DNA sequence: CTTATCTATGTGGCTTACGTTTGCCTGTGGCTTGTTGAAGTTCTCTGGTTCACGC
DNA sequence: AGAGAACTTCAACAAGCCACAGGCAAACGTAAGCCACATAGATAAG
DNA sequence: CTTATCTATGTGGCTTACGTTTGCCTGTGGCTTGTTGAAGTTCTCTGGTTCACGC
DNA sequence: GCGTGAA
DNA sequence: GCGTGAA
DNA sequence: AGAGAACTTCAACAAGCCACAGGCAAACGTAAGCCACATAGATAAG
């Protein structure tokens, strides 16, 4: 507890010794502050207070090869020891996952992520299952079914016959897991119907064009130098990058023409009004805080699904402050938003919007279907006074006030001792997020390890550091 | 200094804990062999011994900023602590220095790598010295000039009159060097040399251009997974990739040829003759000795590319085994040598290769030139600064060294102090200078694996400063 | 070649009783670099790569 | 929504040097009168 | 009531010498085992690119 | 066979 | 001017 | 030329298990004086 105060000139040594270690070795900064560096120094000033000064240190460090095989080994084991807690949790129906093919943009191999998200008491929990390839074969979605049954071995799971799934409308995704549940990714349908959108106004296209083509000048003549703010990626096929492009236009309209006229190519650029993209970009802000409200995963988002159809509707509302292109877009987009979103819509979603503690909007004929599925969804957790027609009543009664800070964790897991039953329904629909960002945070992680200077690596050895590193995220304080 | 060891099962938990670092911050497994590493080691477990088991590293570890601040400071620190030692160097004329630009993969700033290598005692020094961004400054001849005035300036250099400059035959780096010593990079001239006789025979484009599509494809369906052995690169401008490939492809021929008539892309093969591909496989790979011989720069090589072009000279001997492909191919080979590579050379290579110790090459008029060179030349050492230079010469020229493939000239010269000393003072003068540019290279390799993806937001003073820094530790550190 | 008891002398000695002698450590001041600790900013990117699908 | 990683920007503390004078605090000088045990001589039996 | 000394006794610690029995002490010289570890192969790369340069 | 778009 | 052309 | 980084192979070799021979100080029963204390008892005087 109580720790030393050094001599000064002994925190120099330290930071002279460091600092040629990293400059001899081009090792980043950041290495400093490893969580687990301060306790394996820790560890090693603690034996060489028990030992003194003079021991056999180049023989005594291990060497790399045995640290894989000791992190393999010790893979098989804390797996061998959490098979027991996955059947533990996932017996009790209270489970959910993503899905998702990945591929490496240096060997050219494609993989399938498996992975984990359930619920634990007032906390989310995330466990990366696996990540593993199909060697070259034809990626056809049985091979994914039997590489997804090969990992659930791995772990002791057999049935995997009830878990809930949010995907995407990927085609061999959809068959593949047409035999259980398959939910999709809100965060792709709402995109979709943006670029869908955006391409039934072709109005849009010729600005989008000339600020594409502005964009692409910056970039390749070199001139970033004066500028303050650099650009965005023009499309590759990323999520919401066309609200950054526009919006830094928008911030960097000024040195925009002062320097597209030092350079001779205003010409790109006077065929654009400011007006509607500061529209725009009010409007596509909105949509903005849509997604990222939906996008949370370190926290359930489902329960806000209509009222988000709804606040898209009222800022799509018509208006006559419209010109005929704008006003001709916002038609547009909620034509999409109709035929998109009362048809790719589903029952669960309207029960996990049922369960939003302001009872008094999903007052509709909905109670009759959602009562309907909830009968069949309330027995099977007890198959798996206080009397369920009353306790439906009791809680779409119930007001509840909404602080501009509330939160879906706490209200419900407070909550849970009036509900004796529907609690756990809850709770495993709190696990279910409503986008896939786990197969995307864990693709950022994989291609973080996987890099260039790496390329000759076991993916057995891929699977044990990823599933090693979500343990400890998950395991420790 | 007998070095006390610990229980088993105590490196056992040791080897644990090191497992959980490894995978915790997703480091390389390579990097517990640090040689900083054992360092730091041993620092900790001094200090634990020392001041007990209950630090507080909360503090006791320095910020990263602390780290930039303090490597920066360093840097100022030791290329002020050396300046002197590199400015007596200097002075002797012993020294060979080399510059070229560079590009990263990302923000694709413009650079001026500085690298310098001259003769310690019975050790050839390569000291790398500077490295400074262009900006966005158009790059005339006047900034090349300024910065490299600049940079000598850190150094404390003015003088560099007579040092001696290898480069490639760059139009701008001609242009800013069109006062003082330049030597073509013999590397680039040779590369020159095998492409231009290659493009000036388009009868040898057909197996290259069908070589190249069976890679391209071989990429495109991705059918290379099931060889062994991959193919090199298409056409990014890369050293004898043609060479790799063609060779890779004669190895891998079978599988190859198995694997187009499975997937029925036999039809495409059909067109290829293999005996002109062994014959270049041969022939070429003469040359990668060549190669591989000039790029060998830690040792003198300015004494070995007269018999390098005897040696090329014979390899294109003309024989009736060549045919039209390759009779075409090595008339443009001494053709371009002769009117170019040839004419490209320098005097100082013809004295430097005159210290050979079976000095029989050059019995003809090159003799005639290099008294009023060698003369000249060291008339001017002395005064930088009876075995007089004249019978020095005939000295020199008098004896003939047997060729023991076993022997190293290096002590050859390192003894000839005791009877020719300034002599020998000119070729370690001259044999300082490699004959290829490619410590540049290395240079630039150690940059790229600097810079990364992750590490864009980086001061480039900060970059130059981890470059030299590590370029000292490796020059003066074992 | 003792062996005992008295009968004057006579100086340590010592436990207080007390008055100096450093003296050290230690309270307050007053800077002086000197890190340095957030504190945002700014990018890289992860954010899609070859097939099930009805038609 | 992550994640790594480096970068200005304040601007905000803070350990680390002196200057030094004020105690209480350990230890050394006289003195000091009651002891009081140690130091020499007769003296009876012989 | 004591005070001294011889006189007739025991008589069991005791203390060395003798033999007898013992509860293990290294060493044994054969039996398994992670683990540097020396040789590899196999990379993905650097193999810098906009002013020169003049008849 | 036909996109195909959804990744 | 004009076109490689040295990497 | 050089990079920095994971695999792959025999491999042998220095840690731990094992546990029949050969060996040793420790413990016990015995026997020889033995011999130095220990007991009363008397014997004179006072």
Redesign the interface.
Known sequence: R??????AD??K????????????????????????????????????????????????????I???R??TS?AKEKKALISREIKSAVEKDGASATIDLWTDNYI?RNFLGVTLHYHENNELRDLILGLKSL??ERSTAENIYKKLKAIFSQFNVEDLSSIKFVTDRGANVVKSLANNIRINCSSHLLSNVLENSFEETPELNMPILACKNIVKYFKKA??Q?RLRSSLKSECPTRWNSTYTMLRSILDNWESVIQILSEAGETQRIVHINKSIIQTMVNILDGFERIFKELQTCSSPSLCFVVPSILKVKEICSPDVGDVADIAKLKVNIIKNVRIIWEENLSIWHYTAFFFYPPALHMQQEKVAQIKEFCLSKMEDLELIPVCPSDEFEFYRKEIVILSEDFKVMEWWNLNSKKYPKLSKLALSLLSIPASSAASERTFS?AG??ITE??NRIGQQTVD??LF??SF?KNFCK
Not at 2 to 7: A, F, G, N, P, R
Not at 36 to 49: L, N, P, T, Y
């Open positions: 109580e720790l030393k105060t050094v001599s002994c925190k040594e330290a930071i002279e010794k460091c600092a040629q270690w990293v400059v001899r070795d081009c090792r980043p900064f950041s290495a400093v502050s490893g969580s687990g560096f301060i306790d394996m120094i820790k560890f090693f000033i603690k034996v060489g207070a028990e030992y003194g000064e003079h021991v056999n240190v180049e023989e005594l460090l291990p060497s790399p045995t640290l894989s000791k992190v010790d050219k060697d070259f070199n001139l130098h992680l973080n390890i200077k790496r044990s550091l090693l590193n400890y």
